[PDB]
Amino acid sequence: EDLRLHLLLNTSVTCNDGSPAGYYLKESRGSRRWLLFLEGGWYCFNRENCDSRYDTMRRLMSSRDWPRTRTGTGILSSQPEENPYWWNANMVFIPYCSSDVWSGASSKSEKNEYAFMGALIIQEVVRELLGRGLSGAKVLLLAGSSAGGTGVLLNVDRVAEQLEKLGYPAIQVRGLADSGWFLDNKQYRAPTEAIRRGIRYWNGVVPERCRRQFQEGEEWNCFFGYKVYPTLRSPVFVVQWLFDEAQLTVDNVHVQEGLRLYIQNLGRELRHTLKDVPASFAPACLSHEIIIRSHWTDVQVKGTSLPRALHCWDRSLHTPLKGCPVHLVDSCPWPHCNPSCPTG
Ligand SMILES: CSc1cccc(Sc2ccc3n[nH]c(=O)n3n2)c1
Ligand SMILES: *[C@@H]1O[C@H](CO)[C@@H](O)[C@H](O)[C@H]1NC(C)=O
């Protein structure tokens, strides 16, 4: 139970119910690398569905019941055997308690039953960590899974701008977006409408260059990785299963020719969106999330594991590297055509 809870000293930066947000921290005194991980867990987009979430998913809307510690797993593990990539880094787990895909900038008030402060939570965590050693960092990797992976895409450049404006231009900010790269595709039998409604409910904010492209009322576009990624300046590594279970869920998929063609076309479209993403890991598996699973080391694409690919990415950010690839996208067209896919 190696990561210790700190509730935010600025108690106006809150979870949905107005309780303070926070972060779990395990410092590594001999390290200038910082990993800030954004938890996922869907979202809620109106009073009624947020009230439902508060009844049965309250840890995602409140800190009142959070434990004092959490165990770092996968990329958050400090054990080299579990985390070949960054086992010696300073580790931060930021709980998702804003239900806004990390985009919100709205306080609880006379007119708002809930606070949606995901974007401000990240910025407040960063600011408070600067007093705890982040000021000496050489690399800040903002990582996240599921809604947290989309959160990376929405927030990585804002973290880079925050540190520049605070006078730390030497800290290299990078993103690792796991399982947050979705397609606004046709369903097999309204995802984009729920986000459009959510953005208004949350006062959601998107990266500036993406906002300027799509403009007022169209900011929902920036929640889709293939549209927001080209607008970003920070290096971002994209991890995405080609047949992501959450993508299939929103597509109303739960095998005859129509569905076979649908699934194959989904994998093809996902692969196509990653063709010009130089740092990516996209196995042909039906699964969801990878980076904080203890067995995250097991999956390989073209014989290369994700921890290896991430290490190769670090080297590339010091022309391609002999035997140390960073772009790893499966080409086989059906779930589990890659033998290293997770079993479940
Ligand atoms: C509904 S269109 C969309 C597009 C981009 C991000 C999101 S948010 C989301 C989507 C799927 C998922 N699975 N697990 C988890 O946390 N999430 N979060 C939604
Ligand atoms: C606390 O956070 C809010 C919202 O981000 C900010 O407006 C305010 O200035 C902060 N207070 C302090 C003392 O930093």
- Which residues lie closer than 8 Å to 165 by C-beta, 6 or more apart? none
Instruction: Tell me which residue has its CA closest to atom 10 in ligand 2.
Output: 10
Distance of CA 47 to CAs 21, 44, 53, 77, 110, Å? 20, 8, 10, 37, 14
Q: Tokens 């969106």 label which residue?
A: 273
Residue 3 C-alpha to ligand 1 middle, in angstroms? 26
Residues with CB under 6 A from ligand 1: 40-43, 101, 146-147, 150, 182, 191, 194-195, 223-224, 246, 250
Catalytic residue list contains 244: yes
Q: Residue 13: CB within 6 Å of ligand 2?
A: yes
Contact 214, 199 (CB under 8 A): no
Phi, psi of 199 (to 5 degrees): -50, -45
Q: How many whole angstroms separate alpha carbon 116 and alpha carbon 99? A: 7
Cα of 125 vs centre of ligand 2, distance in Å, is 12
Q: Which of 8, 13, 106 to mutate to test the pocket of ligand 2 (most atoms within 8 A of CB)?
A: 13
Q: How was this structure determined?
A: X-ray
- The tokens for 175 are 């993103």
d(CA 34, CA 273): 29
Distance between Cα 160 and ligand 2 center (Å): 19
Q: Which atom of ligand 1 is nearest to the CA of 289?
A: 14
- The whole-angstrom separation of Cα 141 and Cα 35 is 5
| Model resolution, angstroms | 1.4
Whether residue 146 lies in the annotated active site: yes
194 alpha carbon – ligand 1 mean position (Å): 10
Q: Which residues are registered as beta bridge partners of 306?
A: none
Residue 12 Cβ contacting ligand 2 at under 6 Å: yes
Mapped onto helix, strand or coil, the DSSP state of residue 139 is strand
Closest CA to 218 of 226, 206, 232: 206
Contact present, 312 and 324 (Cβ < 8 Å):
yes
End-to-end distance of the chain based on CA atoms, in angstroms?
Answer: 25
Q: Which residue has the tokens 């903002």?
A: 142
Alpha helices by DSSP H, the chain: 47-56, 118-130, 147-165, 191-202, 208-214, 225-228, 245-250, 257-273, 306-316
Q: Is 115 in the pocket of ligand 2 (CB under 6 A)?
A: no
Amino acid at 285: C
Q: Which ligand is nearest to the CA of 181?
A: 1
CA–CA gap between residue 274 and residue 266 (Å, rounded): 13
**For residue 104, which ligand has an atom nearest its CA?**
2
Cα(210)–Cα(219) distance, rounded to whole angstroms? 8
10 CA from centroid of ligand 2 (Å) = 6
Beta bridge partners of 139: 33, 172
Choosing from 19, 103, 178, 288, the catalytic residue is: 288
Q: Whats the size of the chain, residue-wise?
A: 344
